[PDB]
Amino acid sequence: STGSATTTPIDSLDDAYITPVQIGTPAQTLNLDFDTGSSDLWVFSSETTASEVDGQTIYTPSKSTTAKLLSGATWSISYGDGSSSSGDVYTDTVSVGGLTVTGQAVESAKKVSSSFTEDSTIDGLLGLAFSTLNTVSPTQXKTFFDNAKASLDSPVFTADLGYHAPGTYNFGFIDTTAYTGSITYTAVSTKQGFWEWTSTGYAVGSGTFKSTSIDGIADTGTTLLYLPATVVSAYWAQVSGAKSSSSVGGYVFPCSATLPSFTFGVGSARIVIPGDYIDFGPISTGSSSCFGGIQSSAGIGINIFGDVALKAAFVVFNGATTPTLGFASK
Ligand SMILES: CC(C)(C)S(=O)(=O)N[C@@H](Cc1ccccc1)C(=O)N[C@@H](Cc1c[nH]c[nH+]1)C(=O)N[C@@H](CC1CCCCC1)C(O)(O)C(F)(F)C(=O)NCCN1CCOCC1
């Protein structure tokens, strides 16, 4: 089997991407944030405290004929930006781009944090990291991808994120029309549960590629590109108007700049982000100062290849028993 689904920037910044998923019988369609940096399918639901729901679409399990209470199971999660939700656990039929899974764990929020309430466009999260990161106890869990793997034509899914446009998530096959050149594969480490890989260095603009190991995770659920302090400082030192803002919290530059490209290595291969990907947006509507799309990871503890990198590439998540990561240019 295979599936395919249009994914959609939630705003004009590419702050995040949402994807329609059908849950239950007759399907309820919810707009979920596909997140390869966590492994919980959690939704807004009829169980959510009401003063905490705010425009979102909700999952009603009682209205689905195929929902079953997962007795005794609860979950709690918190993300890197400090937001959080908890509640209890159903299994139910879940469908993504015509790819259907049964007795998939759907995690039902009883409470959500403020950031989630205030975010009207995202109805919940589909976690696509490894299943060890799943928060449901007493037994975790296991993601959509894992549940699907047995029926997939290939134990694989691809991320095709568009710049200021729609894109594609595919499961079970690889679309050869979707990129240019060949995929280079790199080794994954599942030690921390992440899509964790090691970049072989970087170049800024037209200058020299520098061979240095950059350990980092590929993370569709993170907006920006976070790199070590000395790599990021080396980029922004090419942009004449760029300074680090304490108040705004990272590198800003004049919106009028033309930014240099940034190349990261994958094995012997190179992936170039266009300078335009890295102009993130004005810090206020009508500002002359913009917020940069590459920031320091020093406060975070790990490097994140997030949306700014990934939407520059056709990215292949190969979940064979030894997982690897694929990059093509597009
Ligand atoms: C607007 C912004 C200034 C650019 S922002 O940084 O707030 N963007 C958010 C994403 C977002 C999209 C749309 C609307 C609102 C917010 C963002 O980048 N969130 C990061 C926070 C971060 C990391 N570094 C610096 N900041 C995050 O938590 N991302 C997780 C997925 C997100 C969570 C918020 C909702 C959208 C999905 C994540 O899973 O990808 C993660 F990897 F970052 C993460 O925190 N994974 C948590 C891993 N858990 C830990 C507990 O054990 C199990 C595993």
d(CA 155, CA 319): 5
- Distances in Å between the Cα of 145 and the Cα atoms of 130, 283, 325, 326 are 9, 37, 15, 17
35 with 243: CB under 8 angstroms? no
| Ligand 1 binding pocket includes 196 (Cβ within 6 Å) | no
d(CA 266, CA 297): 20
Distance 306 CA to ligand 1 centre (A): 10
In the numeric block, the tokens 């259907």 are attached to: 100
Distance 1 CA to ligand 1 centre (A): 31
Q: Which of 14, 36, 222 to mutate to test the pocket of ligand 1 (most atoms within 8 A of CB)?
A: 222
Give the alpha-carbon dihedral of 210, 216, 219, 222, to 10 degrees. -80
| Ligand 1 binding pocket includes 35 (Cβ within 6 Å) | yes
Q: Which residues are catalytic?
A: 35, 199
CATH 3.30.930.10 fits 5-174, yes or no: no
Q: Which of 162, 201, 160, 203 is nearest to 10 (CA)?
A: 162
d(CA 314, CA 329): 6
Task: Kindly give the number of the ligand 1 atom that is closest to the alpha carbon of 300.
Answer: 24
Q: Which of 42, 13, 3 is nearest to 290 (CA)?
A: 13
Residues in a beta bridge with 296 = 227
Pairing verdict, β 84-96 and 250-254 = unpaired
312 with 270: CB under 8 angstroms? no
- Return left, alpha or beta for 237; rule: phi > 0 is left, psi -120 to 50 is alpha, else beta: alpha
Q: Which of 35, 159, 25, 6 is nearest to 101 (CA)?
A: 25
How many Cα atoms are found within 13 Å in the side-chain-facing hemisphere of 316?
Answer: 27
Distance 65 CA to ligand 1 centre (A): 33
- With DSSP H G I counted as helix, E B as strand and the rest as coil, what are the percentages for the chain, rounded to 5? 10, 45, 45
Contacts of 103 (CB under 8 A, 6+ apart): 68, 91, 92, 147
Distance 181 CA to ligand 1 centre (A): 31
**What is the token pair recorded at 264?**
């990261």
| Ligand 1 binding pocket includes 83 (Cβ within 6 Å) | yes
Identify the CATH homologous superfamily for domain 175-330: Acid Proteases (2.40.70.10)
User: Residue 191 CB: number of other CB atoms within 10 A?
Assistant: 9
In the numeric block, the tokens 């919810």 are attached to: 30
| 129-165: burial string, b at 16+ Cβ within 10 Å, e else | bbbebbbbeeebbbbbbbbbbeebebbbbbbbbbeee
Annotate 249-311 with DSSP letters as a single string. Answer: TEEEEETTPPPPPEEEEETTEEEEEPHHHHEEEESSTT-SEEEESEEE-TTTSSEEE-HHHHT
> Nearest C-alpha to atom 10 of ligand 1 is from which residue?
222
Annotate 5-18 with DSSP letters as a single string. Answer: EEEEESSTT---EE
Q: What's the burial of 230, exposed, middle or buried (CB within 10 Å: 0-12/13-18/19+)? A: exposed
d(CA 291, CA 227): 16
Q: Which of 83, 33, 3 is nearest to 307 (CA)?
A: 33
| Ligand 1 binding pocket includes 37 (Cβ within 6 Å) | yes
d(CA 179, CA 272): 14
Residues in the chain: 330
Helices (H), the chain: 114-117, 144-148, 229-236, 275-278, 307-310
Domain ranges in the chain with CATH number 2.40.70.10: 5-174, 175-330
| Ligand 1 binding pocket includes 80 (Cβ within 6 Å) | yes
Interrupted after residues, the chain (C–N over 2.5 Å): none
Distance 300 CA to ligand 1 centre (A): 11
Pairing verdict, β 68-78 and 84-96 = antiparallel
| Ligand 1 binding pocket includes 222 (Cβ within 6 Å) | yes
* Host H or E run for residue 325: strand 324-329
| Ligand 1 binding pocket includes 219 (Cβ within 6 Å) | yes
